[model samples]
Target chain A: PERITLYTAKICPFAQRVEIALHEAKAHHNVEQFQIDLQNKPEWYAPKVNPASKVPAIAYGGPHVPPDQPSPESIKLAESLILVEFVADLFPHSHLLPHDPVKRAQARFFIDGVSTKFIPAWHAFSQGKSSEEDFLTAVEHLQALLPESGFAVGAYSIADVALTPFLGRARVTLKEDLGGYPRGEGPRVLAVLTSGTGRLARFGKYAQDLLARESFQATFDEAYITERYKARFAD
Target chain B: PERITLYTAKICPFAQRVEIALHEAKAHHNVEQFQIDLQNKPEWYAPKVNPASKVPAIAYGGPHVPPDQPSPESIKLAESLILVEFVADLFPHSHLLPHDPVKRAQARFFIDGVSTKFIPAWHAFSQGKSSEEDFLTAVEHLQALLPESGFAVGAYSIADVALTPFLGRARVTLKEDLGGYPRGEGPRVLAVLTSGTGRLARFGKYAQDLLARESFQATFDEAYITERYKARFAD
Candidate 1:
C-alpha cells in the first residue's frame, strides 16, 4: 500500500509471478516497475536490493525515489512466492490468499505441487536431465489435485499467480521444441498438456483459465518471450 | 476452529512444526494428535488422509470419530509450512502470519532461508554427502539474517516455528556425535553453533530463545530423538 518498487526482469518467470500478483492486488495500478538486467546486473542490487541478486525483490513502504537508488530506510524483501504473499497480506480484501482456512490451505497445497513436483520435473526434463515419464508424471500428479473446475482453489488466488509464470514459460518451451530435451519431443509433450484426455484435459483447461486472466495477459510479453526462448535454446 | 485431528510422527522434524504451531495457536489444546509410524505407515493414510502419505496432515471439521477413520466430509490438508499458515488463518488472533505485511514477509523470507540454505546444508553434512564447509557457510548465512536479538522477526512467529524442529534435530545430531559426519566433527560444529564469536554468539542466543519456548518444549522429546537418530544412522 505504501510507495512500492519492484525490481524484476522480463525473461525470468519468477520475476513475472510478482508482476502478475501486483496486477491482481490492483493497488490502483501504482506499482513502480524497475527492470533489472540479469546479464549485467547493477552492482548496488545485491547490497541495496536483494542479497541473493534475484529479481522479484520489493522495496515496500520506502520513500519515493528512483528504483535503482533504493532507499536504505525501506524494508527490502525478496523471493517470488513470499512477495506474492506480502502483496496479499497488504491488500487483505484482495483475497489473494482467500479468507477461508480450508481454501487457503488448498491454494498453498497446489503451490506446493508446483514447487516440489512440477518445477523440478519440468527443469530436469527440459534440460535433458530426466526421463519423459518424469515430467509427464509430475503433470499428472498436479492435475490430480485440481478441483473439477475453476481456478487452483476455486478462485483466482496467489496460488494461481504462483504457477502462472512457470506455466507460461512451459507452454513456450514444449510448444516450440525448446530447451535441451530430445528433438521433436516438445510438441507431443505440449499436446499432453493441452486439452488432452482425462487428467491432462483437466489441467489443460485450468492452465487456459489461468493464462486468460487480465493480470497474466497484461504482464506477459509472449512475443518477446518466444524470441528469448528461441535464441537461448538454440543448439 | 473446527474439530481438528493432526496426523504426525515424532521423529519427523517437518511434522513437529505443525504440532508446535497448534500449541502456539492455543486452539485451547483441543486438537487431537495421531502419530503415524514412519517405519510402517497405515495403508489408509495415503488414500484417505494425505495422498502424499506424509505426516503433519490435518483432517479438519470431520465427524468426531477416530483419527484412523477420517471422514470423507472433512478437508484433508498436508505439508508442514502450509499447515502452520492454515492454523494461523483459522486462528487469526494468533498472528502466526503477523498482522503487519512487512513482518509477515520477513517471517516467510526467513523460512525460505531455512528451507533453501540451512536445512539442505545440515542434511548434506550429516549424511556425509557434502563438505563440512558447505554446511558451515549455510549456518553462517542464516545466522547473519538474524536481527540483533529475539526471534527471526522480533516476535516468535512461523519463521521460528519452521526452524525449531530442524535446529532441535541438528542439536541432537552434533551434541551426540551422531550421523555420517566424521567421528569427532560434531562437537566442534556444536561449539561454532553455540555461544562463540560475534555473529555465532548472536545466533546462538537466538537458538536458545527458540528452543526454550513452551511450544517447542511440550512438542519435542529430546531423549526419544537421540535414540531414534542413533538407530537410523547407526554406523
Candidate 2:
C-alpha cells in the first residue's frame, strides 16, 4: 500500500467517485474529509493540487509527482476521465476496466455522454423553474441510453464509478419524477441511493453487485444522508 | 487522402480546436463551415457528432465513425479536447505532442489549467458587465501559473493548439483591459491580438512555422473579421 491521501466530502458526487475508486481498487489509502465551509478550506487544499480548490483532488504515493519536477501523464490525460482512469490503472486489482481499447473507449464515451448531457439536464431542472416537462425530459434522457446490460460501460469501469454519484444526487433530487422516464428504473436509482446499488441495479439487479463488498459499503455508509435530507427540506 | 467532413462554425472555439489540429496534423479535411444563422441552425448539427450543437463536429475516413455504424468518434469525435488528441494520435507524423507519456501528462495539465480556469474567468468578464477587475483578475490568475517559457504545457503540444483560438478571441475582446494585468510579455496573448494576429493566429502561426502548411489560411485571410468585432465593449 503506497501513501495516498484523498481529499473528499461524502456528499459531493465527484468526491464520492474518487472515494469509490479507492475502495473498489482495494488500495490502502488515508482519507481526509474536508467541509465545504467555502469561507475557509484546509491549507493543504491549496492551488498546488487543484487550482480550482475543487475537492476529490489527490496526493498519490507521497508526491508520486513532485510539484516543480513535472507531474506524470498530464497532457495525454483528459481531466476527470483521465484522472479516474489513472487511478484505476494504478490499482488494477480493482478490475475497474477490461484490457480491450474499444471497450475502454465505449466506457469513456458512455460516461462522458452522461455527464455532458444527462446530469446537466437534471441541473436544468433543479436550478431553473420546475416543470413536469423538465423532470420527465431529464429522466427519459438517461433511460434512453441505459447500457443494454448495465454497469454503464465495459464489464465494470471508471465511467460508472464517476457517474453514479451525479445520477444518485439527481435521482434523490428528482425523486418520483424520474418515473416519467420510459425505463421506469428512474426511481430505482433513488431506491438504491443509500443502498450503494445504483450501479448494480441500473446495470441490472443481480449483475456484478459490487455494492455487497465491504469496501464499497464502508464508503457508502459514510455519506450523511440525514444531513442532506435536512438540508433539502430545510425552510 | 480520406473522405472527411467537418460540421462547424466560425465563432466556436471548440470547432476551431479541431480545425487547428487537422492543420497541425497536416490532415487534408473537407472544411464545411456553418453559421448558427442567429436563431436557426441546420438539423445537420443536431445530435450527430456533438449532442450540444456546439461547433466543430466531424465525420472522418468517410464521415460515419464505423463506416457501417459511424458513432461520433467513428464519424468524427466531438468535444474539443478529445478531438484534438484523437487527431494528433492518428497522425503521429504531425508531432502535435511529445512522445513521452509523462511529458504529455504535464502538457494536458497545462492545457487543462488554461481551458478550465482561464475560460471561466473570461466568461465571468464577458457575461457580466465589462468589469475591469474581473477581466484583470482572470488575466492575473493566468499570469501566475505560466511555465517559465513555451506556448503552454512543455514547449509545444496540442494543448496550445486547442486553446489558441480562444486566446486570440480573448485578446481581441479585452484589448487595453488586458494591459492592466501584472505581466508585460505576460500578456503576450492580449498583445498578440492587437497585432491583428486575429482568431486563427495561435495554431495559424504554428501551421506555418512548425508544419509549413496552411489550408486553414483561407479561413483566416479571406474571412470577414470586422463584422464580428465585440459589440459588448469593456468599460
Candidate 3:
C-alpha cells in the first residue's frame, strides 16, 4: 500500500472527482486529504506542492519508501483528470480503467468528445450568459453517448469517474434555475430525469444511478457548493 | 497486417503529426492517404467520416478482420493526439509508447504541461502580439522540462510525437521573421537549441535530432509551409 497526500478543496468539482475515485477504491485511508483555502491559498502550496497552484494535486509516496526515511518525500502530481487516471493505474485491482487497450481508447474518446462539446456550455452557464437551448443541447448529446443498459463502456470505468462530478454538480446546482436564468421555461439541467419531458430516458436513469452512488454522495457537499458559487456569481 | 486509411491535408500540422507516427512505425504502405481541400470541403466528408470535419482522422481495419472480405469497413477514430496514441497501442512492437505504465504517465504529464505552458505563446507569436520576454520565458520553461538526453520520457514516445510537429513548424517558419520580432537576438522557437546560448544543451541536441529524423523531415515541407503561412499572415 502506498501513501498519498491529496491537496484538495471541497467546493472544486475537479478535486471532488479525485475524491470519488479514492472513495470508489475504498482507499480513502491511503490518501491524506488536506483542504486548501482557494481564495486565500497558502504560501507553501506553490513551488513546494504544485507550481500551478491548483487543487487536486497529489504527493505519492513511492510504494516501498518508508515515511521516516531521510528522503521520503513523495512524487507530486497535478491536474485532476490525470490524477484520477493515476490513482486508477495505481490500484489496478480496482478496475477503474478497462484492461483492453481498444476499450480504454473508446473510453478516452468519449471523455474527450463530451468535454469538447459541453465544457464551453458549462463556462457560458457559469458566467450567466447561456441560453436554455444550449443547456438542453448539451444534455441531449450526453444522453446519446450513454449506453443502453450498464455504465459507460459496460462497466464502471474512468469515463464515469471523469464525468460524474460535473454531472452531479449540474444536477445539484442547476436543476432549479440554471443560475437564475429567467427565460428558461423548465428545469434547466436534467429535465429528462425530473419531468420525463426530455428525450433520453436511459440517460435520466444513469444520472440518477450516479447521484445515488455512495462515492458521489459522500464527496459532493451540496450546501457548500451552492453557497460558494452563489457568492461567486453575486456580482 | 490490417489496412488503414489516414484522412489528411498536406498543409495541416495536425495531420502531419499522425504522419510522423506512421513513418516512425514504418507502416506508411499500410495506410492509404487522402487529402481534403480545407477551403472547399466535400459534401460527404463530415457526415460519412468525421462529424467535426477535422483532419487526422483514421479508419482502422481491425486486426482479425479479413482484408478481402466484403464490408470490411474501418473503425473511425479522430483527433491527432489520440490517433497517435492509438496507432502506438495498435502496434506494440513499434515502441511508440513505453511498456511501463509509470513511464507512460510521465510522458503524458510532460506533454500536458508543455501544451498548457507554450500553446498560448505560439498563438500570441502567430498573431504578432507577443513580446520577446514572453517568448523567452516559455523557452526557459521548455528547457527545464527536457531530459539530459534522448527523447521526452527518455525514449522515442508519443510525447515527442505530439510536440515535435508544432515546434518543427515554429522553428522552420517563425525563426526567420517572427512578425517584426527583433532579429539577431535568437531563434523564436527552440531558442535553447541555437548557438548554445541557452542552458539546455541536451534539449538543443535533442531538437537537432528531431529535425533531422526522416519522420519529421518527410512531413514538415518547409517551402510549402513558409508559403502557406506567409500568405495566411499577409493582410
Best-performing candidate as measured by DockQ: 1
Each candidate structure's TM-score, on Cα atoms with residue i matched to residue i, is 0.96, 0.67, 0.87
State each candidate's chain A TM-score. Answer: 0.95, 0.68, 0.87
TM-score of chain B of 3: 0.86
In candidate 2, what are the lDDT values of residues A1-235, reduced to their tens digit? 4445455656666776777777778663543333443346655445345657776665544434433332443221224544565567667778776655435544665666667665676666555545545544554544444566656552667767766666555645545343344344545544543342543334334223434444445665334643564465554
Using Cα atoms, each model's DockQ against the true complex is 0.91, 0.14, 0.44
Residues B1-235 of candidate 2: C-alpha lDDT, one tens digit per residue:
3455666567666677777777767664444434454257656556555566666655655543432233444444456676676666666788886765445655666666667666776676545545545555554554444454444554557866765666655554444343334435325545443332554344334323322224234334223432364333423
Q: By descending lDDT, how would the candidates be arranged?
A: 1, 3, 2
Candidate 1 docking classification = high
Cα lDDT, all candidates: 0.86, 0.54, 0.73
Which candidate, 1 or 3, would have the higher lDDT against the true structure?
A: 1
Q: Give the better candidate number (2 or 3) by lDDT.
A: 3
Q: lDDT score, residue B176, model 3? A: 59
Q: What stretches of model 1 exceed 4 Å from their correct place?
A: A179-184, A196-199, B181-184, B196-199
Error of 3 at B176 (Å): 4.4
Docking class of 3: acceptable
lDDT of 3 by residue, B68-117 (tens): 22123566778887788778877778788887656677778777866766
lDDT by residue (B1-235, candidate 1, tens digit) is 8898999888999998998898898873788899898879999999999887888899989688888888999988899999999888887777677888888888988898999999998988888799878987898887887888788988889999999999999989998888566777797788778754654787888888888899998899899999988877775
lDDT of 2 at A84: 64
Model 2's DockQ? 0.14
What does the lDDT come to for candidate 1? 0.86
